[PDB]
Design a protein around this ligand. Structure first.
Ligand code: NAG
Ligand code: NAG
Ligand code: NAG
Lengths: 316, 170, 170, 316, 170, 316
C-alpha cells in the first residue's frame, strides 16, 4: 500500500535564535563565540623576551634591571606589571608613543656615538642605580663639573646617523633637589640644554627644587628622545644638568609587544594574546578581552551565539 | 518553515533515522521498512558545511596595542580610544548576532526546502499510480513488493509498468 | 513573491477580510461565505512579532562625551574624533538600511509562503474530490453544504465520504 | 461547487524598501528611526545638578559662581553655555581631560590640606572674584609677599593622600600684568614653582607681561592639576606667583555629564540625552543627534527606515 | 536551489534560449519549437535590476585627511589613526563580502523561484489534460497543433475545449 | 505529444560566491570592487591649486616659494612631496592641525594689521629667503635692535579682528645660533615674548644655541599660530627674538586638500582622489587606497567581489 518520507530528529536537540523566533530547537548547533583561554603566552615558533623587572623604555637608557636587555632581539616582547624604566626617579617625555615604537621594533642594536669630553667629570653616579655600589644608566654619562661648584664649560656635542634606518636618541635633564645641589654639581648661574636636528628642535631649562622622596632622591630626571633620520645630525648645546647619551639605538626588524601577567610556554603555538593568556581558536568571535592583540577573533559583548548546523528538530 | 514540510505537513521527525537526514518509511505486504536518502541528506549537509567553511575564518590582520594596562595613558587620548573601541565592539556584536540569526533562519528554511524537494521528487516519480495522503505519505494504488519500494528509492520506478493496475483502482 | 501566491496566482487581497490575514471564501448551494484561518494568520503574526521583539532592542552600553559643544577641543584631536564618529555613522546607517530592506524582503516572502502553505493544505485535504481552478480556488466535484465547507475549514473533511460521487463527476 | 482561499488587503497600505524593489506597498509597517524629542532633561530617578553660571572646573577652584557647588553630589551633571571656570582670567592646562574626569565622578568631597604659612600674606584678593567686594577662589589662597616688594621667602609645602581613592590637586601660576606688578607682589629676581609626586613631575616659571583686558586684568592665572595616588605625596617648591591649594578634592561615586540648552523636568524619566532634550524610545535607531549620550539608539543619516510588519498589499 | 527547479528537476539550461531567461520548448505533430516567456524573464530581470540600483550607490559624505603622507604625524596619534582606520577597513571588508554572498544566494534562489512559478503556471493552465513527466515537461493527452502550443504560451489555452479527449486518453 | 519548459545557459559562465558554496558558476556577473585608477587629478569643474615647491603653511608666512600663493583661491588644493613651509629653518607648533584647517578653507584673503614700529629695525633679512639676494617671509617683519647690541625696547603691539569670521595670526620666535648672535641682534639679558587673547594665552622664551646646519643656519624659528575671534583682540609683549606678523589671514570659502604625486587634468571630472590619481566609479567598494579622500567608495581588503546578475548556469 504506502510509501512515506520523513527526516531525522533527536530527543534532545539544542536551542538557537533566528530572525523570527527565539530559542528554536534544532538538531545540532555549534558555538561561534570563543571563551577558551590558555593561561600561558604561547611563544613557540617566535623569539620571545620576558622583561620582568626591566621596563621597556629602560632597555634604551639601561638602568640596573635592563642590563640583560641592552641589545635584545625579539619577535614577541613581553611587559610585566613590575617592570621599570627608571632607577634614578624621572619620567619619559612622550613615554607611550615610544613604548609603542619599541613594541614593534624586533629588538635594538646599540652603537657608540663617539662623544669625547674635556675637563669635566664623565662618571657621575648614584646610590639608586646599584651595581658596584653606586653607578648609573649604562648608556648615559652623568656629566658633572670638574670639582664642586666649578662652572660647567659651555659645550656642544654632535652625532650623524650614518645608517640606512633612523636612530633613536635619548638624553636626560637632571632637575636637582635644591638650588644648592645644582650649583654644587654644575656651578651657579642659569643653565640651558638645547637639542636640534632637521626634524626636531626643542630646548630645556632645569628646574631645581624639592619633590617627594622617590628612591631616596628629591630631584628628578626628565628623559627626552628623538628620532634621527638617515644622513641627518643631532646637536646638543649645554652647560650643566645634562645627562648625555653614550650610545644610540637602532631598530632591528619587526615584532609585537604584549602586556602579560601569565607564564610563558614554548610548547604551544599562538597568534592572539591577551593579558591573561593566549586565544587559539577558529571561531570568528570572542568574549574574552576587548583589548586582546595579534591576529584575533572580533570581540563581542555576547557570551554565546549558537549557529545552527542542522534542521528544525521535531521529536515524537 | 518557509516550505511547510519539516515541522509542517510532515508531522514530526524520526528519532530512528540514524542513517541520514532524510528518508523513506514504507509499509507493504511484506512488512515495513525505513531507509535514508543519500542525495537529499548529502545536499543539506554540503550546504551547511559551506556555511561553516565560510564562518570559520581567520582574518590575516594583526592589531597591536594603542592602550596600556600597566601605566594608563593620558586621559583625553585614552578616553577617545576607549570610546572608539567600545563603538567598534557595538558594531561587531551586532554583526555577530545578526549574522547568526539570519544564518539560522536560512539553514532551517534550507532543510525544509530539501524535504519538500525530495517529497516532490517521489510524487513526480509515481505520476498517476499513487495519491497524496497529506501527511507526507503516498498511498500506492497497486502492489508494491520490497523490490518496488527499492526501485522508488533508487529512482528506477517505471510508472508505465503499474499504470494500468493502479489507474484501474480509480 | 518568492512563492507566487500573494500578488501571484491569487489575483488580489480581500479588503473585507477583517478577521485575520488569511481565509476561505466559498460559494455553494446555500450562498456564499467568508471566514478567516486562525492557524496560518497566527503563524504569520507570531513570526513578524518575533522580528519586532528582536529589532526593538536596547543595548546596555553607555557612551559618554569625548567632544565639547561649548569650548571646542584641540583641532587635530577633535578632527580625529569627528572622523571616527562620521565613519561610525556611515557603518550604522548602512547596517540599518540593509537590515530593514532584507527584513522587509523576508517578511513579504514569509507571508507569501504562509498563503501557499494554506492553499496546499486544503488541496491535500480535498485529495481527488476537487480540481484546481488556478486562481486559488478549488472547484469541488460534489455537493458542498455549509457544514461541508465548515469541515474543510476546521480540517475535518473526510475525502472518503465524497470520493465516489466526486470522482464519478470525472 | 467551489472553495477559494485568499489573504487580506487594505485600500491604503504603506510603502517600504526591500533588497529587490523600492517602495513596495505592504499592509502595515512600523518606524525604526526615532525622531521624537522631549525638550527637557528627563531627570526623574537620578540626582541632578544644573550648574548655570558655574563652570565645571570651577567647582574645584571655587570662584564666585561655583560657591553653590564646592562639595556637590550627583548622578547627572549639567553644563550650561554660560558656565565659567574662572573669575580672575586664566586657562586650565589640559582642561577637557579634567572636564571628562569630573563629568563621571558622582560629585566631589573636599578636604583640607593642612597648609600653614609663615611670614607672608595668605589673603590675596581681587575685584574680579566679587563677594565682600574683592575676594578670591574659595579653595585657593593667593600667597603674597609680606608687604610690597618684600622678597618672597623660598618655601616648600607638602600633602599626603591618606585615603583609598586618589586625590585631585589644583594649583595656579599668576602671570602678572607687568614686571613691575610681579616685583610689587613677590619681589624682584627670578621665580619658579616646581611640582612633584611619583606620577607627576613638572615645573613653572611665571611670564609677566600685558595681555588683552579680560575682566579688567591684563595678567592671567595658569591653572594646573594633578591626580595624587593613595599613600602618595605632593610637594610644592616656590618663591612667588604661586596660587596655593587650601583643600584637595575627592571623587564620590559615579555620574554622567551632559551639555544641555533646555530646562530640567523631574516628572519624566530618561537615559538618552542630547543638548536639546531627552530621547525616550524603543527604536534601535535615531536621526536626532550624532553626539547624543547615555544609553542610546544608534545614530543614523536616515530620516526614516520603515520596517514592514505585514504582507504584500494587493487591493482590488 | 531553494526551489529545486533550476539545477534541479529541470536537468539543464538551454544554450539556444537567446530570447530571454525562461521559455517553452514543445514537440508536436508539426515538429518542434522553442519560444521565450516574457513575463517570467522580465520579472527576474526587474528584480536583479533592483538589486543593482540599490548596490550601485554613492554616499554623499565627504571624508578629508587626518593623516599626512609627506611629513608623518606624531607617533601616538597616527598610531591611533592607523588602528581606527584599519578596524574600519575590517568592518567594511566584512560587510562587503557578506553583502555579496547573501545577495548571490538570494539572486540564485529568486531565479529558481521564477522557474518554478512559470512551470506551475502552465501546470495550472493545463488542468487535467496533461501529466507531469518530472523532467519539467508536460505530456499532453490530446493533440496540440502549433496554434494550441501558442495558446499555452500566450495563456489562452482553454482546458474545456480539450478535456473530453484528453481525459478519455485516461 | 509534449511541451517542455526550461531556462537559458551559456558554455562559459562566471563563478561567484554564495552563503553556502564557493565559486558557483552563474550566467553573468558584475564587479563590485573598483580597481581602476586615473593617474591624473581630475580637476575639471573645480578651481584647482598646485603648490609644488610651496608648502601649505608657507602660504601664510610667505617664504620665497609661496609668493605665488599669498592670497590664493581654491576649491581643490594640492600638496606636493617637495613643498616647503620654510626658508629660514624652523618648525610650526601644532603644524598638522593648521594644515587641516587650511586644506578646507577655500583659500586665504590677507589683510594688514597696522603695526607701526619706533626706533628699531623693521627690515631684518637673511641669505636663505632669497629674492633680491637676502630677504624674508613676505608677511613677517624680522624686528631687530636699532644697531648691534642695542638693548631692544620693551614693546607691545595689538590687533582687533573686526570681521565676521575669525582671523589666523602667525608669529615667530627666533632662536639664535649662539648667545653672542642673540645679544648681537637684540641686546644682552633675558628675552620674553607673551601672546594673549581671550581664547589663547601662552608665552615664549628664546633658546639660543647651536643646532645642525640646516640651510646654512644653526638657530631656528619657532612658528606659532592662533585663531582670533570676531570682535576679539591679540596682544604681543616682547623685547627681542620676535618675528612679527605684518598681515593676518582670513578664510574665504570651502575646499578640500589632497596630497598628490601625479599630473593635473582639467579634461576629466572627479570626486574621489588618492595620492596616485582619481577614482571615478559607480562601484560601492574599492581596493585602491585605504586613505583616499572625497566622496568615495568604501575601502576593502578584497581585490574582487563578484555579484551575480544572472541564474545558476547549467550547460550541456
Ligand atoms: C578604559 O576602560 C578600562 C576598562 O578596562 C578602564 O580600566 C580605563 O580606566 C578606561 N580608560 C579611561 C582612563 O577612561
Ligand atoms: C565636528 O563636527 C560637528 C558637526 O557634527 C561640527 O559642529 C564641529 O565643528 C566639528 N568639530 C571638529 C573639530 O571635528
Ligand atoms: C600608517 O600606515 C601607513 C601605511 O599603511 C604607514 O606608512 C605609516 O607609517 C603608519 N603610521 C604610523 C605612524 O604607524
Amino acid at each position: 500500500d504506502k510509501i512515506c518520507l520523513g527526516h531525522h530528529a533527536v530527543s534532545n536537540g539544542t536551542k538557537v535564535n533566528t530572525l523570527t523566533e527565539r530559542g528554536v530547537e534544532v538538531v545540532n548547533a555549534t558555538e561561534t563565540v570563543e571563551r577558551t583561554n590558555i593561561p600561558r603566552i604561547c611563544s613557540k615558533g617566535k623569539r620571545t623576551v620576558d622583561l620582568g623587572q626591566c621596563g621597556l623604555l629602560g632597555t634604551i637608557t639601561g638602568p640596573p634591571q635592563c642590563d640583560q636587555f641592552l641589545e635584545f632581539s625579539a619577535d614577541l616582547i613581553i611587559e610585566r606589571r613590575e617592570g621599570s624604566d627608571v632607577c634614578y626617579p624621572g619620567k619619559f617625555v612622550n613615554e607611550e608613543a615610544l613604548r609603542q615604537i619599541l613594541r614593534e621594533s624586533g629588538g635594538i642594536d646599540k652603537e657608540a656615538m663617539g662623544f669625547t669630553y674635556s675637563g669635566i667629570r664623565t662618571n657621575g653616579a648614584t646610590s639608586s642605580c646599584r651595581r658596584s655600589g653606586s653607578s648609573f644608566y649604562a648608556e648615559m654619562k652623568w656629566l658633572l663639573s670638574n670639582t664642586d661648584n666649578a662652572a660647567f664649560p659651555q659645550m656642544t656635542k654632535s652625532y650623524k646617523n650614518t645608517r640606512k634606518n633612523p636612530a633613536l636618541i635619548v638624553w636626560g635633564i637632571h632637575h636637582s633637589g635644591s638650588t644648592a645641589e645644582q650649583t654644587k654639581l654644575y656651578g651657579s648661574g642659569n643653565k640651558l640644554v638645547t637639542v636640534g636636528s632637521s626634524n626636531y628642535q626643542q630646548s630645556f631649562v632645569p628646574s631645581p627644587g624639592a619633590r617627594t622622596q622617590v628612591n631616596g632622591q628629591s630631584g628628578r630626571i626628565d628623559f627626552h628622545w628623538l628620532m634621527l633620520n638617515p644622513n641627518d645630525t643631532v646637536t646638543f648645546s649645554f652647560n650643566g644638568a645634562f645627562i648625555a647619551p653614550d650610545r644610540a639605538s637602532f631598530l632591528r626588524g619587526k615584532s609585537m609587544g604584549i602586556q602579560s601577567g601569565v607564564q610563558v610556554d614554548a610548547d604551544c603555538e599562538g597568534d592572539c594574546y591577551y593579558s591573561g593568556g593566549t586565544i587559539i581558536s577558529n571561531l570568528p568571535f570572542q568574549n574574552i578581552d576587548s583589548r586582546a592583540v595579534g591576529k584575533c577573533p572580533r570581540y563581542v559583548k555576547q557570551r554565546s551565539l549558537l549557529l545552527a548546523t542542522g534542521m528544525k528538530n521535531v521529536p515524537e | 518553515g518557509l516550505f511547510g514540510a519539516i515541522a509542517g505537513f510532515i508531522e514530526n521527525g524520526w528519532e530512528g533515522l540514524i542513517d541520514g537526514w532524510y528518508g523513506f518509511r514504507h509499509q507493504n505486504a511484506q512488512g515495513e521498512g525505513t531507509a535514508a536518502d543519500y542525495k537529499s541528506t548529502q545536499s543539506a549537509i554540503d550546504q551547511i558545511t559551506g556555511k561553516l567553511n565560510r564562518l570559520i575564518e581567520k582574518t590575516n590582520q594583526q592589531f597591536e596595542l594603542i592602550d596600556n594596562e600597566f601605566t594608563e595613558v593620558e586621559k583625553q587620548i585614552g578616553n577617545v580610544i576607549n570610546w572608539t573601541r567600545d563603538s567598534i565592539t557595538e558594531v561587531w556584536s551586532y554583526n555577530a548576532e545578526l549574522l547568526v540569526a539570519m544564518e539560522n533562519q536560512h539553514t532551517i528554511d534550507l532543510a525544509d526546502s530539501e524535504m519538500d524537494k525530495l517529497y516532490e521528487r517521489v510524487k513526480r516519480q509515481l505520476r498517476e499510480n499513487a495519491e497524496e495522503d497529506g501527511t507526507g505519505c503516498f498511498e500506492i494504488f497497486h502492489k508494491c513488493d520490497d523490490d518496488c519500494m527499492a526501485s522508488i528509492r533508487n529512482n528506477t520506478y517505471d510508472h508505465s509498468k503499474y499504470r494500468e493496475e493502479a489507474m484501474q483502482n480509480r
